[PDB]
Amino acid sequence: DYKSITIATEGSYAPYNFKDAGGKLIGFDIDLGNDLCKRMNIECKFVEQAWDGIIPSLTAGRYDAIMAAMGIQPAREKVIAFSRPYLLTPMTFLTTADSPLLKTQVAIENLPLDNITPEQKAELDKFTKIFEGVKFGVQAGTSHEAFMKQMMPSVQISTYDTIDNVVMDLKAGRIDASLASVSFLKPLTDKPDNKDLKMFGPRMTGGLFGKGVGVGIRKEDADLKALFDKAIDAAIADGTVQKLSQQWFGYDASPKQHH
Ligand SMILES: N=C(N)NCCC[C@H](N[C@H](CCC(=O)O)C(=O)O)C(=O)O
Ligand code: NA
Ligand code: NA
Ligand code: NA
Ligand code: NA
């Protein structure tokens, strides 16, 4: 049943995991991680780890789990295991409030990508054509990068160490647009600080975006995955995930029972 675990997080992806005024790690991932460990009867310790290297540091045994807004993504499933999802959110585009990209008609509001029908492909092709000549920025090593490189290869993309640097460059006009989850973009654009930023386009799920946010765990740690899965099911069931989601995101992005 374990006694103590070390959970890695990035600390540059608000409101999932970031730093407070005193430099302490805070956010939905921290609050949920602490709640889950309390249910598992395990001592919880959060450590900071750069996004670039967070998966090989887990497999190298530098810590026991990852809670860092990490999507349960098929490429990642080849390397590590995941808990069942603790948050579910679609992906959408981001630009500035004065951008002509905002006027683009969205033919498909909710776009599931596990299977891409010709109709869905025509919508993706439309946005690809509109974005040719638009400078995109994404955080390196994300499903956002994977989507742009696989689904929109003709679009110029710049990759960044952190999403904070993406946002800085979008505000400065060094890039024209970005891509991230609604769970990241809604709290970002809700801030009065970011009235100059707007979400737009289809809300996409599945495909290379994966099956929701999960706890990253080594494949051989089957018992640790079982403990997390039981704790997450209980935290969803009693409304804890919904409560924390409302607190950090300003809305309910918690998953539903029976999957
Ligand atoms: N900088 C970080 N600590 N994490 C970046 C994670 C970005 C992305 N996941 C987050 C969380 C939502 C999800 O994957 O279902 C997002 O899309 O906003 C991903 O797994 O590459
Ligand atoms: Na990754
Ligand atoms: Na919204
Ligand atoms: Na409370
Ligand atoms: Na808030």
mmCIF file of C-alpha atoms and ligand atoms in Angstrom:
data_model
loop_
_atom_site.group_PDB
_atom_site.id
_atom_site.type_symbol
_atom_site.label_atom_id
_atom_site.label_comp_id
_atom_site.label_asym_id
_atom_site.label_seq_id
_atom_site.Cartn_x
_atom_site.Cartn_y
_atom_site.Cartn_z
ATOM 1 C CA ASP A 1 0.000 0.000 0.000
ATOM 2 C CA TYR A 2 3.185 2.291 0.040
ATOM 3 C CA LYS A 3 4.161 4.728 2.855
ATOM 4 C CA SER A 4 5.418 7.831 0.955
ATOM 5 C CA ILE A 5 5.500 8.923 -2.710
ATOM 6 C CA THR A 6 7.137 11.753 -4.633
ATOM 7 C CA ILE A 7 4.954 13.404 -7.330
ATOM 8 C CA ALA A 8 6.578 15.511 -10.043
ATOM 9 C CA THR A 9 4.951 18.578 -11.502
ATOM 10 C CA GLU A 10 6.155 21.341 -13.804
ATOM 11 C CA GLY A 11 5.041 24.544 -12.074
ATOM 12 C CA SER A 12 4.498 26.616 -15.281
ATOM 13 C CA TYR A 13 0.945 25.586 -16.317
ATOM 14 C CA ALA A 14 -1.627 27.619 -14.364
ATOM 15 C CA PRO A 15 -4.120 26.747 -12.918
ATOM 16 C CA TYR A 16 -3.033 23.058 -12.904
ATOM 17 C CA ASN A 17 0.470 23.599 -11.492
ATOM 18 C CA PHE A 18 2.255 26.884 -10.917
ATOM 19 C CA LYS A 19 4.028 28.911 -8.242
ATOM 20 C CA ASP A 20 2.582 31.214 -5.605
ATOM 21 C CA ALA A 21 4.182 34.489 -4.365
ATOM 22 C CA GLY A 22 6.509 32.518 -2.023
ATOM 23 C CA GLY A 23 7.624 30.152 -4.818
ATOM 24 C CA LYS A 24 5.537 27.217 -3.454
ATOM 25 C CA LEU A 25 3.944 24.749 -5.940
ATOM 26 C CA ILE A 26 0.159 25.349 -6.107
ATOM 27 C CA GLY A 27 -2.810 24.484 -8.318
ATOM 28 C CA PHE A 28 -5.461 21.912 -9.170
ATOM 29 C CA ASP A 29 -2.831 19.112 -9.631
ATOM 30 C CA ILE A 30 -1.284 19.903 -6.186
ATOM 31 C CA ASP A 31 -4.661 20.078 -4.380
ATOM 32 C CA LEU A 32 -5.908 16.894 -6.110
ATOM 33 C CA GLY A 33 -2.608 15.030 -5.600
ATOM 34 C CA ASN A 34 -2.720 15.829 -1.844
ATOM 35 C CA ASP A 35 -6.411 14.774 -1.643
ATOM 36 C CA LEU A 36 -5.709 11.442 -3.492
ATOM 37 C CA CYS A 37 -2.720 10.581 -1.223
ATOM 38 C CA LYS A 38 -4.889 11.274 1.868
ATOM 39 C CA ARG A 39 -7.447 8.688 0.488
ATOM 40 C CA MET A 40 -4.605 6.197 -0.257
ATOM 41 C CA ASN A 41 -3.081 6.747 3.267
ATOM 42 C CA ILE A 42 0.299 7.745 1.711
ATOM 43 C CA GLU A 43 2.612 10.710 2.573
ATOM 44 C CA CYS A 44 2.598 13.184 -0.377
ATOM 45 C CA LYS A 45 5.648 15.186 -1.569
ATOM 46 C CA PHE A 46 5.471 17.417 -4.701
ATOM 47 C CA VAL A 47 8.748 18.149 -6.569
ATOM 48 C CA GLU A 48 9.416 20.554 -9.457
ATOM 49 C CA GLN A 49 10.577 19.031 -12.760
ATOM 50 C CA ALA A 50 10.897 20.739 -16.168
ATOM 51 C CA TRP A 51 8.338 19.483 -18.737
ATOM 52 C CA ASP A 52 11.244 18.505 -21.065
ATOM 53 C CA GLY A 53 12.397 15.349 -19.297
ATOM 54 C CA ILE A 54 9.447 14.740 -16.920
ATOM 55 C CA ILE A 55 8.657 11.294 -18.503
ATOM 56 C CA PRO A 56 12.281 9.840 -18.637
ATOM 57 C CA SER A 57 12.883 11.126 -15.049
ATOM 58 C CA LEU A 58 9.840 9.072 -13.944
ATOM 59 C CA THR A 59 11.037 5.920 -15.788
ATOM 60 C CA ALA A 60 14.569 6.483 -14.360
ATOM 61 C CA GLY A 61 12.980 6.333 -10.829
ATOM 62 C CA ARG A 62 13.677 9.957 -9.779
ATOM 63 C CA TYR A 63 10.041 10.090 -8.433
ATOM 64 C CA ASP A 64 6.909 7.858 -8.351
ATOM 65 C CA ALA A 65 4.265 9.722 -10.336
ATOM 66 C CA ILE A 66 3.513 12.742 -12.536
ATOM 67 C CA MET A 67 0.611 15.183 -12.013
ATOM 68 C CA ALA A 68 1.374 17.971 -14.485
ATOM 69 C CA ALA A 69 -1.743 18.519 -16.661
ATOM 70 C CA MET A 70 -0.563 15.457 -18.603
ATOM 71 C CA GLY A 71 -2.906 14.139 -21.279
ATOM 72 C CA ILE A 72 -3.337 10.319 -21.524
ATOM 73 C CA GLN A 73 -1.851 10.416 -24.989
ATOM 74 C CA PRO A 74 -1.177 7.290 -27.194
ATOM 75 C CA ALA A 75 2.546 8.162 -27.737
ATOM 76 C CA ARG A 76 2.948 8.552 -23.913
ATOM 77 C CA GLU A 77 1.100 5.234 -23.261
ATOM 78 C CA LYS A 78 3.932 3.464 -25.110
ATOM 79 C CA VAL A 79 6.357 4.710 -22.394
ATOM 80 C CA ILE A 80 4.391 4.945 -19.110
ATOM 81 C CA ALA A 81 1.040 3.915 -17.617
ATOM 82 C CA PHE A 82 -1.710 6.308 -16.556
ATOM 83 C CA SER A 83 -4.368 6.434 -13.882
ATOM 84 C CA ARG A 84 -7.921 6.708 -15.122
ATOM 85 C CA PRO A 85 -8.644 10.373 -16.117
ATOM 86 C CA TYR A 86 -9.206 12.993 -13.394
ATOM 87 C CA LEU A 87 -10.171 15.858 -15.771
ATOM 88 C CA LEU A 88 -11.692 15.886 -19.300
ATOM 89 C CA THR A 89 -11.401 18.899 -21.594
ATOM 90 C CA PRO A 90 -11.459 19.680 -25.341
ATOM 91 C CA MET A 91 -8.690 21.587 -27.194
ATOM 92 C CA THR A 92 -9.232 24.852 -29.016
ATOM 93 C CA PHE A 93 -7.348 27.733 -30.671
ATOM 94 C CA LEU A 94 -6.167 31.031 -29.154
ATOM 95 C CA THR A 95 -5.485 34.385 -30.843
ATOM 96 C CA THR A 96 -5.686 38.146 -30.112
ATOM 97 C CA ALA A 97 -9.033 40.000 -29.764
ATOM 98 C CA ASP A 98 -8.345 42.093 -32.926
ATOM 99 C CA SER A 99 -7.449 39.062 -35.115
ATOM 100 C CA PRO A 100 -9.439 38.532 -38.386
ATOM 101 C CA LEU A 101 -9.090 34.753 -37.546
ATOM 102 C CA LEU A 102 -11.936 35.350 -35.004
ATOM 103 C CA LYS A 103 -14.436 35.880 -37.881
ATOM 104 C CA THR A 104 -13.850 32.300 -39.223
ATOM 105 C CA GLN A 105 -17.066 30.281 -39.377
ATOM 106 C CA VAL A 106 -16.972 27.153 -37.196
ATOM 107 C CA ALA A 107 -18.966 24.411 -39.029
ATOM 108 C CA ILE A 108 -18.294 21.752 -36.315
ATOM 109 C CA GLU A 109 -18.469 23.055 -32.710
ATOM 110 C CA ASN A 110 -17.400 19.714 -31.123
ATOM 111 C CA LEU A 111 -14.897 17.779 -33.151
ATOM 112 C CA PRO A 112 -13.990 14.206 -31.989
ATOM 113 C CA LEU A 113 -10.794 12.935 -33.636
ATOM 114 C CA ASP A 114 -10.558 9.144 -32.657
ATOM 115 C CA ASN A 115 -12.123 8.601 -36.072
ATOM 116 C CA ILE A 116 -11.985 11.539 -38.603
ATOM 117 C CA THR A 117 -14.945 11.457 -41.023
ATOM 118 C CA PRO A 118 -14.609 13.222 -44.456
ATOM 119 C CA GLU A 119 -16.835 16.017 -43.045
ATOM 120 C CA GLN A 120 -14.502 16.448 -40.040
ATOM 121 C CA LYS A 121 -11.456 16.294 -42.345
ATOM 122 C CA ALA A 122 -12.977 19.117 -44.508
ATOM 123 C CA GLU A 123 -13.280 21.279 -41.315
ATOM 124 C CA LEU A 124 -9.643 20.546 -40.309
ATOM 125 C CA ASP A 125 -8.521 21.302 -43.921
ATOM 126 C CA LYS A 126 -10.453 24.630 -43.843
ATOM 127 C CA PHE A 127 -8.602 25.759 -40.657
ATOM 128 C CA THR A 128 -5.270 24.467 -42.083
ATOM 129 C CA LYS A 129 -5.783 26.729 -45.176
ATOM 130 C CA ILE A 130 -6.841 29.744 -43.082
ATOM 131 C CA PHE A 131 -3.641 29.184 -40.876
ATOM 132 C CA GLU A 132 -1.194 28.935 -43.793
ATOM 133 C CA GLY A 133 0.732 32.217 -43.311
ATOM 134 C CA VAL A 134 -0.351 32.461 -39.612
ATOM 135 C CA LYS A 135 2.606 32.002 -37.187
ATOM 136 C CA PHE A 136 1.708 29.422 -34.523
ATOM 137 C CA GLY A 137 3.370 28.869 -31.177
ATOM 138 C CA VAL A 138 2.930 25.810 -28.903
ATOM 139 C CA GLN A 139 4.729 24.376 -25.876
ATOM 140 C CA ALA A 140 7.271 21.674 -26.979
ATOM 141 C CA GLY A 141 6.455 18.015 -26.090
ATOM 142 C CA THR A 142 2.652 18.544 -25.929
ATOM 143 C CA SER A 143 -0.271 16.947 -27.773
ATOM 144 C CA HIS A 144 -0.682 20.578 -29.160
ATOM 145 C CA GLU A 145 2.696 20.212 -30.934
ATOM 146 C CA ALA A 146 1.818 16.638 -32.059
ATOM 147 C CA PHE A 147 -1.536 17.856 -33.518
ATOM 148 C CA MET A 148 0.043 20.777 -35.426
ATOM 149 C CA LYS A 149 2.890 18.616 -36.850
ATOM 150 C CA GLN A 150 0.647 15.662 -37.860
ATOM 151 C CA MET A 151 -2.681 17.344 -38.759
ATOM 152 C CA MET A 152 -1.515 20.806 -39.955
ATOM 153 C CA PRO A 153 2.074 20.194 -41.244
ATOM 154 C CA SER A 154 1.887 23.132 -43.711
ATOM 155 C CA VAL A 155 1.356 25.615 -40.812
ATOM 156 C CA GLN A 156 4.527 27.377 -39.510
ATOM 157 C CA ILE A 157 5.035 26.327 -35.906
ATOM 158 C CA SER A 158 7.477 27.577 -33.236
ATOM 159 C CA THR A 159 7.905 25.428 -30.090
ATOM 160 C CA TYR A 160 8.527 26.866 -26.626
ATOM 161 C CA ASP A 161 9.928 25.597 -23.331
ATOM 162 C CA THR A 162 6.793 26.793 -21.391
ATOM 163 C CA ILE A 163 3.236 27.846 -22.232
ATOM 164 C CA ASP A 164 4.029 31.140 -20.347
ATOM 165 C CA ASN A 165 6.555 32.004 -23.094
ATOM 166 C CA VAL A 166 3.922 31.118 -25.789
ATOM 167 C CA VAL A 167 1.446 33.565 -24.156
ATOM 168 C CA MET A 168 4.162 36.284 -23.810
ATOM 169 C CA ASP A 169 5.012 35.976 -27.553
ATOM 170 C CA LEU A 170 1.303 36.023 -28.564
ATOM 171 C CA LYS A 171 0.776 39.209 -26.486
ATOM 172 C CA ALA A 172 3.965 40.731 -28.027
ATOM 173 C CA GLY A 173 2.860 39.821 -31.594
ATOM 174 C CA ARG A 174 5.834 37.462 -32.265
ATOM 175 C CA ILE A 175 3.272 34.688 -32.992
ATOM 176 C CA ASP A 176 -0.328 34.974 -34.250
ATOM 177 C CA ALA A 177 -2.087 32.013 -32.647
ATOM 178 C CA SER A 178 -1.743 29.012 -30.346
ATOM 179 C CA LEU A 179 -3.545 25.802 -29.362
ATOM 180 C CA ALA A 180 -4.253 24.397 -25.877
ATOM 181 C CA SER A 181 -7.107 22.896 -23.841
ATOM 182 C CA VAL A 182 -10.202 24.882 -22.855
ATOM 183 C CA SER A 183 -9.168 24.066 -19.234
ATOM 184 C CA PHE A 184 -5.989 26.189 -19.783
ATOM 185 C CA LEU A 185 -7.467 28.839 -22.162
ATOM 186 C CA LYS A 186 -10.749 29.621 -20.383
ATOM 187 C CA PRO A 187 -9.115 30.710 -17.018
ATOM 188 C CA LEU A 188 -6.415 32.513 -19.117
ATOM 189 C CA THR A 189 -8.973 34.514 -21.208
ATOM 190 C CA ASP A 190 -11.320 35.032 -18.192
ATOM 191 C CA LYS A 191 -8.660 37.212 -16.531
ATOM 192 C CA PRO A 192 -9.272 40.984 -17.052
ATOM 193 C CA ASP A 193 -5.453 41.003 -17.710
ATOM 194 C CA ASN A 194 -6.169 39.042 -20.960
ATOM 195 C CA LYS A 195 -9.153 40.901 -22.520
ATOM 196 C CA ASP A 196 -6.829 41.204 -25.598
ATOM 197 C CA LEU A 197 -6.857 37.323 -25.965
ATOM 198 C CA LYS A 198 -9.721 35.158 -27.357
ATOM 199 C CA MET A 199 -10.482 31.443 -27.848
ATOM 200 C CA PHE A 200 -11.817 30.407 -31.299
ATOM 201 C CA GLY A 201 -12.447 27.450 -33.564
ATOM 202 C CA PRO A 202 -13.732 23.913 -33.054
ATOM 203 C CA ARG A 203 -13.444 22.283 -29.624
ATOM 204 C CA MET A 204 -11.539 19.044 -30.377
ATOM 205 C CA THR A 205 -11.226 15.765 -28.416
ATOM 206 C CA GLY A 206 -9.511 12.387 -28.883
ATOM 207 C CA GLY A 207 -7.079 11.300 -31.569
ATOM 208 C CA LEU A 208 -3.589 12.491 -30.699
ATOM 209 C CA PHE A 209 -5.089 14.635 -27.885
ATOM 210 C CA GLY A 210 -5.821 11.421 -25.963
ATOM 211 C CA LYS A 211 -8.365 10.424 -23.297
ATOM 212 C CA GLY A 212 -8.182 13.101 -20.566
ATOM 213 C CA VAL A 213 -5.667 14.219 -17.903
ATOM 214 C CA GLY A 214 -4.125 11.398 -15.879
ATOM 215 C CA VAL A 215 -1.489 10.579 -13.277
ATOM 216 C CA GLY A 216 1.665 9.292 -15.034
ATOM 217 C CA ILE A 217 3.028 6.115 -13.382
ATOM 218 C CA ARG A 218 5.739 3.551 -14.335
ATOM 219 C CA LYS A 219 4.211 0.532 -16.202
ATOM 220 C CA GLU A 220 5.661 -1.955 -13.643
ATOM 221 C CA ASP A 221 3.929 -0.090 -10.729
ATOM 222 C CA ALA A 222 0.550 -1.865 -11.225
ATOM 223 C CA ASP A 223 -0.279 -1.599 -7.460
ATOM 224 C CA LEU A 224 0.327 2.206 -7.446
ATOM 225 C CA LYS A 225 -1.966 2.593 -10.517
ATOM 226 C CA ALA A 226 -4.686 0.518 -8.709
ATOM 227 C CA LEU A 227 -4.415 2.769 -5.573
ATOM 228 C CA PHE A 228 -4.653 5.974 -7.703
ATOM 229 C CA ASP A 229 -7.614 4.594 -9.771
ATOM 230 C CA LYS A 230 -9.572 3.760 -6.563
ATOM 231 C CA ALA A 231 -8.742 7.214 -5.037
ATOM 232 C CA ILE A 232 -9.737 9.076 -8.286
ATOM 233 C CA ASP A 233 -13.041 7.133 -8.570
ATOM 234 C CA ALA A 234 -13.855 8.124 -4.924
ATOM 235 C CA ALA A 235 -12.781 11.802 -5.450
ATOM 236 C CA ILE A 236 -15.022 12.039 -8.577
ATOM 237 C CA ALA A 237 -17.942 10.217 -6.850
ATOM 238 C CA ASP A 238 -18.042 12.507 -3.747
ATOM 239 C CA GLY A 239 -17.742 15.758 -5.777
ATOM 240 C CA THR A 240 -14.149 16.619 -4.699
ATOM 241 C CA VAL A 241 -12.867 16.832 -8.322
ATOM 242 C CA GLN A 242 -15.899 19.023 -9.280
ATOM 243 C CA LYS A 243 -15.211 21.296 -6.242
ATOM 244 C CA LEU A 244 -11.468 21.665 -7.054
ATOM 245 C CA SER A 245 -12.237 22.177 -10.789
ATOM 246 C CA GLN A 246 -14.647 25.057 -9.958
ATOM 247 C CA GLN A 247 -12.077 26.587 -7.533
ATOM 248 C CA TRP A 248 -9.103 26.552 -9.944
ATOM 249 C CA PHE A 249 -10.722 26.672 -13.449
ATOM 250 C CA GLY A 250 -13.924 28.624 -12.664
ATOM 251 C CA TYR A 251 -16.010 25.744 -14.163
ATOM 252 C CA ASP A 252 -16.603 21.979 -13.893
ATOM 253 C CA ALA A 253 -14.216 19.902 -16.053
ATOM 254 C CA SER A 254 -14.492 16.758 -13.846
ATOM 255 C CA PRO A 255 -15.134 13.372 -15.593
ATOM 256 C CA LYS A 256 -18.369 11.319 -15.165
ATOM 257 C CA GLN A 257 -18.655 7.810 -13.536
ATOM 258 C CA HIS A 258 -19.114 4.537 -15.640
ATOM 259 C CA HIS A 259 -16.490 6.188 -18.022
HETATM 260 N N1 LIG B 1 3.163 22.427 -19.107
HETATM 261 C C1 LIG B 1 2.612 21.384 -18.499
HETATM 262 N N2 LIG B 1 2.864 21.118 -17.206
HETATM 263 N N3 LIG B 1 1.787 20.486 -19.219
HETATM 264 C C2 LIG B 1 1.469 20.741 -20.594
HETATM 265 C C3 LIG B 1 0.376 19.708 -20.956
HETATM 266 C C4 LIG B 1 -0.367 20.127 -22.251
HETATM 267 C C5 LIG B 1 -1.355 19.028 -22.673
HETATM 268 N N4 LIG B 1 -2.370 18.739 -21.666
HETATM 269 C C6 LIG B 1 -3.150 19.789 -21.068
HETATM 270 C C7 LIG B 1 -4.301 19.170 -20.209
HETATM 271 C C8 LIG B 1 -5.521 18.674 -20.990
HETATM 272 C C9 LIG B 1 -5.380 17.307 -21.735
HETATM 273 O O1 LIG B 1 -4.278 16.916 -22.223
HETATM 274 O O2 LIG B 1 -6.413 16.574 -21.893
HETATM 275 C C10 LIG B 1 -3.736 20.775 -22.094
HETATM 276 O O3 LIG B 1 -4.007 20.380 -23.255
HETATM 277 O O4 LIG B 1 -4.010 21.950 -21.728
HETATM 278 C C11 LIG B 1 -0.586 17.767 -22.966
HETATM 279 O O5 LIG B 1 -0.801 16.723 -22.290
HETATM 280 O O6 LIG B 1 0.290 17.753 -23.868
HETATM 281 NA NA NA B 2 5.304 14.564 -23.308
HETATM 282 NA NA NA B 3 -16.490 28.850 -22.813
HETATM 283 NA NA NA B 4 -12.030 22.309 1.223
HETATM 284 NA NA NA B 5 -10.313 31.149 -10.248
#
